Structure formats: C-alpha cells, structure tokens
Specification:
about 375 residues; 2 domains; nine-stranded mixed sheet; 15 strands; hydrolase inhibitor; Serpin; Serpin48 inhibits SPE specifically; SPE; monomeric
Length: about 375
C-alpha cells in the first residue's frame, strides 16, 4: 500500500478466522461474512477517532502505526478489487446524528481513501432514518440488498451507525456445464440426507491439497482474472465442527498444486446480516462503543459521538457460470475426487487476500 515496509493483505487474512469464530456464535446454519470489508470501514472510523479510542481499533486490526501508511495501504487494496473480469460491489456509509455536522474533511477521506461515504441523518424518527439508509444501500447495490437496517436498532441514543453492504461478481475460469446439473445427496450429517441441485466438472486441473493435520481436502476453484473460491472439505461427513475448533489452520495458505480432479459442487445462495459491534467487542474494540469514546475527527467534541451500531449485510449466489452470474451459453471440446456432499467452509480470495468467508451446513 504504502511501501516503506504485503502485511495489510496479511492482517486481513489473520483477522478472517477471528471474525469467523465470532460470527459462528450467533449464526446457527449457513453464513457469509467479509472481514476485509468490515475492516476497511472500521479503518475509516478509526481515522476520525483519537487517543486510546483510535489506537485500540489499530491494535485489533493489527494494522500499521503510521497514518500515511494505513491510508495508503487500504487505498491500494480497494482500488484493485475492481477488475475487468470481476467486481466487488460495496455500499459503505457512516451515518451521523444530525446535531453534529460531519466535518467535510472526513466526508472527503471516506470517498477518496476508504471507498465509503459519511452523512448526517436524524435518528429521531426511527423509521424514516432506517428507510433512508436502506434506500441508499439499495440504489448503491442495484436493489440487490434490501432492508439492511432494522429500524428497531435505532433509538434516542443512536449517534454513529456504520453500514456495510456488499456482494461479489465473478466468472468461473472453467464454468460448470448446466446439462449435467442434477439433484443429488447432500449429507447434513450421517443420519440425515437431502436432494439438492449439484453441478459437475470432470477431468480438470485445479489447485488441490490434502491437509493431514486437518483431515480434510482443499480445492481452489479459479475465477477469471485471478480471483478464486476455496472449499475446505472435511474427510468425514460430520467433520465441520472439528475444522472450526481449528479454524485458524483452515484459512492458512497451503502448498496447493494442480492435480487432476473431478468436482461435485452444489449450487448455493446465502444471505447474512452481521452485527460487527458484537464481533469487534470480543476482539478488543471497547472505547469506541462507550463513554470514553473519542470520535471528534468525525464531528463534535470528545464524548459527543460513539459508534452505536455496525451492520454488515452480504450475499453470495453460486451457480454454473460463477457467482452472481446470469445464465449464459457455453460449450467445450483416474482423477482425484472432490465431492462436496456434506457441510463445508469456503472463502473467496483476490490476489492472496481473503474477501469473503463462510460455511454451508444446510441446503434444500
């Protein structure tokens, strides 16, 4: 990012499993989360904070000290997540209590550096505020993400709200042939099975790895432009919890090599809404949410504003052409087996950086 001494891409990757472990606590089935995107929003917040407040956020993001560096670093990653071959869509905003006019300097850095914006809003009228924020999110996500803010979360004390909506769009480098898509067994556990739409791709060379410590297999499915979707598949039907007790190892980079493989991957769609205040509190951000809070870089004086809520909403829709891809039309000219037919972890990487992570434990 800024080069005097990458370790921002690296900080996100270590942040990722910590976030996953927290989200698990409240999510009981499938989920999707972007630790990366949340991280860039919180970094925006951090820039408007001061003293121990801002320093804490820095500590938890295990982000770098210098502000030209932090800002430059985040500015670089965000600029690259726009490709000819794939696009990350984000609607990130920091809405602030009307009483305290947002400093123009902060609204500017939001746009110029952190791919977000900031705006004053009256939280008094709960439902108008909610609608306003949600309508903005809809316009910015082509109406794909709706009702992000539940007006019930708003109250007389709402001071600063972080909104973080996103979704990813990419094409498989080697798409699945839809003719071969069929209903097949998916084992949610030993005792229960279901029939769900499953896609099939044979005799392809994909990055593959057998992790012996984890008793799992890993497969990296390539997107056009260098992005990828990585599945972490336990060798045993009910082995997911095990992988989650060792969640750190599951996201670590491995010596993946191209092996000849057949793949059976269910189609899946997931929508998640994540309370990142809850997450960040367990990870070490305390001051910014309470009385000692210092958001004077955003507006007002110390103690006027606190971060009241942090809400991420995202979805993923996995199909034959890729993710959030419309049905096109295509034709082409003793393999390892990668049959994804029980619960698994997945994650999307771009240029070595994890963008999204999640799990599927249930399908229909």
């Amino acid at each position: 990012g800024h080069m005097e001494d990458q370790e921002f891409p690296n900080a996100v990757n270590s942040f990722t499993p910590s976030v996953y472990k927290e989200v698990l606590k409240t999510e009981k089935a499938n989920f999707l989360v972007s630790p990366f995107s949340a991280a860039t929003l919180l970094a925006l917040a951090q820039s408007g904070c001061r003293g121990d407040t801002a320093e804490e956020i820095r500590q938890v993001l295990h982000f770098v000290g210098d502000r030209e560096k932090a800002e430059g670093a985040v500015k670089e990653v965000l600029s690259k997540l726009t490709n000819e071959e794939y696009t990350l869509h984000t609607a990130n905003k920091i809405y602030v209590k009307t009483n305290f006019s947002v400093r123009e300097e902060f609204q500017k850095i939001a746009v110029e550096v952190y791919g977000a914006q900031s705006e004053n809003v009256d939280f008094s009228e709960k439902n108008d505020a909610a609608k306003l924020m949600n309508a903005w999110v809809e316009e910015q996500t082509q109406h794909k993400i709706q009702n992000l803010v539940d007006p019930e979360i708003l109250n007389n004390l709402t001071r600063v709200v972080l909104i973080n909506a996103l979704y990813f769009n990419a094409k498989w480098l080697v798409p699945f042939p839809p003719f071969h898509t069929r209903k097949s067994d998916f084992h949610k556990s030993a005792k229960e099975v279901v029939q769900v739409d499953t896609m099939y791709l044979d005799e392809q060379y994909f990055n593959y790895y057998e992790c012996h410590h984890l008793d799992a297999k890993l497969l990296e499915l390539p997107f056009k432009g260098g992005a990828s979707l990585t599945i972490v598949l336990s060798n045993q039907i009910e082995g997911l919890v095990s992988l989650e007790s060792k969640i750190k190892r599951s996201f670590l980079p491995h010596n993946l090599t191209k092996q000849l493989v057949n793949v059976a991957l269910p189609k899946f769609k997931i929508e998640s809404t994540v309370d990142f205040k809850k997450v960040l509190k367990k990870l070490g951000v305390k001051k910014a949410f309470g009385d000692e809070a210092d958001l004077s870089g955003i507006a007002g004086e110390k103690g006027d504003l606190v971060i009241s809520n942090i809400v991420q909403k995202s979805f993923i829709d996995v199909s034959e052409e890729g993710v959030e891809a419309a049905a096109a039309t295509y034709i082409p000219v003793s393999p390892k087996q990668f049959i994804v037919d029980h619960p698994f972890i997945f994650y999307i990487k771009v240029k070595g950086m994890i963008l999204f992570a999640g799990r599927v434990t249930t399908l229909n």
